[PDB]
Design a binder for this molecule. Structure first.
Ligand code: GSH
Length: 112
C-alpha cells in the first residue's frame, strides 16, 4: 500500500502511538528492533505496562502500520520508537539518546 495508506489507518497509528508512554513498532526478525526492545525493557526497565510494542511481522496489517509510520515521520525502518510524544526514530537514534543522557530525561515521566 505504501503511500496509499489511508487517513484512517494513519489516524489509528497515531492513536496507537499515543496509547502508551513507550511505543515501538518492532519486527521480531529485525536485529535493531531486538536491540531497541532489549534496551527499553531489559536494560532500562521500562515497565511493559507503560509500552505498546507492535510486532509488525506478527501483524496482518503490519505493512500498513509501517506505511502509516512512514507517512507520520518519513521513517521507513524498524524499529520505530516514540516515547512521550517524541519521535525517537530507530535503534541507532535510541542509542544516541541513551548515551546523551537525554533518553533518561525523556523516560523520567514514564517511570512516574
Ligand atoms: S532490521 C529492519 C530494517 N531496520 C533498519 O535498517 C533500522 C535502521 C537502523 N539505523 C536503526 O534502527 O538503528 C528495516 O526497517 N528495513 C526495511 C523494512 O521494510 O523493515
Amino acid at each position: 500500500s505504501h503511500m496509499m495508506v489511508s487517513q484512517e489507518t494513519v489516524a489509528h497509528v497515531k492513536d496507537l502511538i499515543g496509547q502508551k508512554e513507550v511505543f515501538v513498532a518492532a519486527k521480531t526478525y529485525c536485529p535493531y528492533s531486538k536491540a531497541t526492545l532489549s534496551t527499553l525493557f531489559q536494560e532500562l526497565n521500562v515497565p511493559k505496562s507503560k509500552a505498546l510494542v507492535l510486532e509488525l511481522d506478527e501483524m496482518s496489517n503490519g505493512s500498513e502500520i509501517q506505511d502509516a509510520l512512514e507517512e507520520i515521520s518519513g521513517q521507513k525502518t524498524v524499529p520505530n520508537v516514540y516515547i512521550n510524544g517524541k519521535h525517537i526514530g530507530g535503534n541507532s537514534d535510541l542509542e544516541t539518546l541513551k548515551k546523551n543522557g537525554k533518553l533518561a530525561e525523556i523516560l523520567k515521566p514514564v517511570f512516574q
